[PDB]
Amino acid sequence: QDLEFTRLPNGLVIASLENYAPASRIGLFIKAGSRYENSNNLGTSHLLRLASSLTTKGASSFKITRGIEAVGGKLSVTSTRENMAYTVECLRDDVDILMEFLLNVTTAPEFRRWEVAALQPQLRIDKAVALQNPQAHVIENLHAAAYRNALANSLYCPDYRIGKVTPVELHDYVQNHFTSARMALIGLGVSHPVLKQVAEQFLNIRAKAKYHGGEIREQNGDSLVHAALVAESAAIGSAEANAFSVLQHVLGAGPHVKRGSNATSSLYQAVAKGVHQPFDVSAFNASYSDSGLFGFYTISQAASAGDVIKAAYNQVKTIAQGNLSNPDVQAAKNKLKAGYLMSVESSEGFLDEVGSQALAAGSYTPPSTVLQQIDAVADADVINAAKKFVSGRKSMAASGNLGHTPFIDEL
Amino acid sequence: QDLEFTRLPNGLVIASLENYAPASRIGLFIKAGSRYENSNNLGTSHLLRLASSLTTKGASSFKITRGIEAVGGKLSVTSTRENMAYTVECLRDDVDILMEFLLNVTTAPEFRRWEVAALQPQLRIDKAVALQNPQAHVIENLHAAAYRNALANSLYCPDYRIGKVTPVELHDYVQNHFTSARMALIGLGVSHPVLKQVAEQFLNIRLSGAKAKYHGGEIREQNGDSLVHAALVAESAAIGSAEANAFSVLQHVLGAGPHVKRGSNATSSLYQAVAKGVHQPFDVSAFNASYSDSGLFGFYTISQAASAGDVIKAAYNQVKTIAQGNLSNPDVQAAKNKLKAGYLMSVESSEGFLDEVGSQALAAGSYTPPSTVLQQIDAVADADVINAAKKFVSGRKSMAASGNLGHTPFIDEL
């Protein structure tokens, strides 16, 4: 079948693709990420990721939990700095139940304060777990430096707001962003007019990422240095941004082979020529509706990172000068064509690509057309892309034992 | 009497001033602050501030504690990023006891590991107490930005080194910096050759320091607090330079805190300049830090969350106008009278005097009498004070804050 798609006069979107799968899948995306938080109501969105499965006007927290598990369904939340996502899974004989539970969470939650207060310390858990993975320190402390207010906001609540988030801020945040204009309802293995029936019946309701640059240095006790160095980018959808996406793979954005030596990654090889001590490196490419970021992510030892980062910085530098050949670029295209299609292979990874476009575009982009956009990329744009990285103002962030780590200006 | 002074061939210094006070006072200063810590052995000096009153080869931790208290003496430690200080108080009939305890702490401590491990969590206390006073966040997070390695080091141990400081690092830090070349023994109400007798007998003993390379930058510690604490500074002149005295004058011209209780700081150009714009509770004052290698100068800020962006610009402009040339002699003459007072009032006590004696002694080959210091104040020209302000405006900046920064600017917006 083909992906249905439309829009409501209230600005709401619907899609549908009856894949004939046994298990349906429905996902309500939205533009209510963490960038929409001011300095006052921080940690709000982290509470909302957990505020699902709470009391509603349509049902209680107990009915929701068991009513889902009785049919063996699923309920999961995903967030980005821009977008949020409420998603379900179930069998297509059980769609109508999960919707009634889904919308009561989204549309009309009550957020009774005691349930909220019992939920606050869960933040300390979900945060500190995900910060075991050291990248989450770096990336969060990185966006705090590159950008000022909006996209610099953390997905994860800071420590001082714990037990201070009110229901008042939530309902405000609900009413201020959970609007039909910002939403995009999506369903797979499901018919189109059903979601029309649901949305018309129920969902029919009512800052800038200013770049600054800078640097963070989180000295900690750990033998490995985690570090990143980036510059301002192009927003998603620009052909300019596709050039970075190509440039990302030219440098090598992680191994394709298990335990491979990353033979084609110009960075990992360029570092290997200088360094002979365990390391890792890869291309970082973040994109957003207003802006994005590009550069590379670093892992090294405490007494060798100062060599690794310079080598990566020079490899990008040579490519900006003009040192780049077509087949190298053609290879990165074949990678990018693969990275996209392999992402949307599953129902889930597909589902993220559908509504992201739907919120960021007035229509779904078929993947075949995306492949055409890849081929449209010129090698010179990829070079001018690298020029921006070198010439543009930088943003930096690290964590570890920084006894030998340089700064921006030394690079 | 007059302040005795000399130096030993091993590079050790002694002074003495028999003030005929009932209570003696002795202080062993040294160049072993926090700048001498690398990234590996951080928190070391914070442990040493507490590692006093531990076991030694000369005595046990119990003997030291009670033997002092039995005579009602005192033992206190002071540290700076450059210097440390071990000081005592006692009655002059009880000098020889406190010395034997003092030197055994300094000269030959054992640092037996279990006592050390029982002492580690005390760091979490002494730190977090002093960080109740919000300035300590700002100032520490400030030096981390202005400077790279040496003076950027915190006096206070970071959280990850807790329970990881070894005795090995200490004895190394002892042997690497507790040398006779870096010390300066001082005693008041005490005779000179006594300290000569002690030092020659005991202190006659044997890592280099690092540079305070300036970088600039900014820190922004978003927290839940209605008040914004903030600072903005630039690179300075080291202590002893006549250049540095100009800042010290410029410090008082702007107003480095009230002289009157609850006064409106009538002469503080900053507090008045802010007052012309703002009509909501605030505070501001001149910040002037100086060090042997470098220093810092600027101003410290306190404002509300939704008004600091106006306060800092007003202070920035008041300094800016003065750099352009807007400055008169009697305004400058007033700040001199302040500075002449701030110095003399500091060295009024035996204690505040004692810090001024040995600081010079470590940073100079001889004591500077205060009368000569007053001459150096009068030597300052108004134009140097203006060129001083030019450096603040023209030089690269360093910034730091803490609070609700919803409306707070950056360096570049200033």
Q: What is the full DSSP assignment across A245-266? A: HHHHHHH-SS-SSTT---TT-H
**Distance in angstroms (rounded) separating the CA atoms of residues A353 and A85:** 12
Expt. technique:
cryo-EM
**Distance in angstroms (rounded) separating the CA atoms of residues B408 and B402:** 10
Residue A212 touches chain B, beta carbons under 8 Å: yes
Q: Given B42, B148, B410, which is nearest A212 (Cβ)?
A: B410
CA distance B144 to chain A (A): 9
Does residue A35 contact residue A151 with C-beta atoms inside 8 Å?
yes
Q: What is the resolution of this structure in A?
A: 4.1
Interface test with chain A among B141, B220, B304, B399, by most A beta carbons within 10 Å = B220
Question: Both B229 and B206 in a single domain?
Answer: no
Q: Six-digit token pair at B107?
A: 């000269």
Does residue B15 contact residue B3 with C-beta atoms inside 8 Å?
yes
**Distance in angstroms (rounded) separating the CA atoms of residues A189 and A389:** 43
Domain end: B210, B237, B262, which one? B210
Sheet containing strand B283-290, edge to edge, reads: B217-222, B397-403, B227-235, B295-304, B283-290
CB contact under 8 A, A403 and B40: yes
Q: Given B160, B222, B224, which is nearest A221 (Cβ)?
A: B160
Question: Both A287 and A330 in a single domain?
Answer: yes
CB contact under 8 A, A39 and B410: no
Quick check: helix, strand or coil at residue B360?
A: helix
Residues of B in Cβ contact (< 8 Å) with A214: 217-218
Nearest to B300 by CA among B238, B250, B229: B229
Quick check: helix, strand or coil at residue B285?
A: strand
Chain A: residue whose CA lies nearest to B162: A221
Torsion-angle region of residue A197: left (phi > 0), alpha (psi -120 to 50) or beta? alpha
Other CB atoms within a 10 A radius of the CB of residue B50 amount to: 17
**Distance in angstroms (rounded) separating the CA atoms of residues B342 and A302:** 46
Question: Both A106 and A120 in a single domain?
Answer: yes
**Distance in angstroms (rounded) separating the CA atoms of residues A377 and A329:** 9
Distance of CA A7 to the CA centre of its chain: 25
CB contact under 8 A, B224 and A161: yes
**Distance in angstroms (rounded) separating the CA atoms of residues B157 and B153:** 9
Other CB atoms within a 10 A radius of the CB of residue B163 amount to: 12
Does residue A84 contact residue A45 with C-beta atoms inside 8 Å?
yes
Residues of A in Cβ contact (< 8 Å) with B224: 160-161, 164
Domain end: A138, A173, A207, which one? A207
Residue B223 touches chain A, beta carbons under 8 Å: yes
Quick check: helix, strand or coil at residue B353?
A: helix
**Distance in angstroms (rounded) separating the CA atoms of residues B303 and B265:** 16
Question: Both A215 and A202 in a single domain?
Answer: no
**Distance in angstroms (rounded) separating the CA atoms of residues B56 and B289:** 36
Angle between helix axes A326-343 and A379-391 (nearest 10 degrees) is 90
Does residue B55 contact residue B109 with C-beta atoms inside 8 Å?
yes
| CATH number, position B55 | 3.30.830.10
Nearest to A154 by CA among A10, A60, A57, A43: A43
Other CB atoms within a 10 A radius of the CB of residue B178 amount to: 21
CB contact under 8 A, A40 and B404: yes
Does residue A147 contact residue A209 with C-beta atoms inside 8 Å?
yes
- Which amino acid does the sequence have at B224? G
CB contact under 8 A, A164 and B217: no
Interface test with chain A among B37, B38, B39, by most A beta carbons within 10 Å = B39
Q: Six-digit token pair at B184?
A: 């300066």
**Distance in angstroms (rounded) separating the CA atoms of residues B179 and A200:** 83
Question: Both A198 and A256 in a single domain?
Answer: no
- Which amino acid does the sequence have at A376? A
3-state secondary structure B150-164: CCCCCCCCCHHHCCC
Handedness of CA B157, B158, B163, B166 (dihedral sign): negative
Domain count of chain B? Answer: 2
Question: Both A196 and A86 in a single domain?
Answer: yes
Residue A411 touches chain B, beta carbons under 8 Å: no
Residue B217 touches chain A, beta carbons under 8 Å: yes
Interface test with chain A among B215, B405, B407, B414, by most A beta carbons within 10 Å = B215
Nearest to A380 by CA among A338, A320, A302: A320
Which backbone phi and psi does B349 adopt, to 5 degrees?
-70, 165
Identify the bridge partners of residue A187 per DSSP, sorted by sequence position: A26
Q: What is the DSSP letter of A29?
A: E
Q: Six-digit token pair at A253?
A: 């954005």
Q: What is the DSSP letter of B406?
A: T
Range of the domain at B250: 211-414
Chain A: residue whose CA lies nearest to B407: A39
CA distances from B184 to A193, A255, B17, B86, B192 (A): 88, 60, 14, 11, 13
Does residue A344 contact residue A367 with C-beta atoms inside 8 Å?
yes
Question: Both B290 and B225 in a single domain?
Answer: yes
- Beta carbons within 8 Å of B297's beta carbon, 6+ residues apart: B233, B234, B236, B247, B250, B251, B286, B287, B288, B289, B388, B392
Question: Both A294 and A149 in a single domain?
Answer: no
Where is A216: in which H helix or E strand? strand A214-219
Nearest to B170 by CA among B111, B121, B217, B224: B111
Question: Both B229 and B152 in a single domain?
Answer: no
CB contact under 8 A, A403 and B38: yes
Question: What angle (nearest 5°) sits at the alpha carbon of residue B365, between those of residues B363 and B366?
Answer: 105
Chain A: residue whose CA lies nearest to B223: A160
CB contact under 8 A, A160 and B215: no
CA atoms in the 13 A half-sphere facing the CB of A298 = 31
Question: Both A254 and A303 in a single domain?
Answer: yes
Other CB atoms within a 10 A radius of the CB of residue B324 amount to: 11
Domain end: B210, B232, B256, which one? B210
Q: What is the DSSP letter of A202?
A: I
Question: What angle (nearest 5°) sits at the alpha carbon of residue B197, between those of residues B195 and B201?
Answer: 115
- Beta carbons within 8 Å of A267's beta carbon, 6+ residues apart: A251, A252, A281, A282, A283, A296, A311, A312, A315, A316
Chain B: residue whose CA lies nearest to A147: B410
**Distance in angstroms (rounded) separating the CA atoms of residues B381 and B329:** 9
Question: Both B278 and B249 in a single domain?
Answer: yes
Residues of A in Cβ contact (< 8 Å) with B220: 144
- Beta carbons within 8 Å of B172's beta carbon, 6+ residues apart: B41
Question: Both A203 and A243 in a single domain?
Answer: no
Rg (CA), chain A: 23
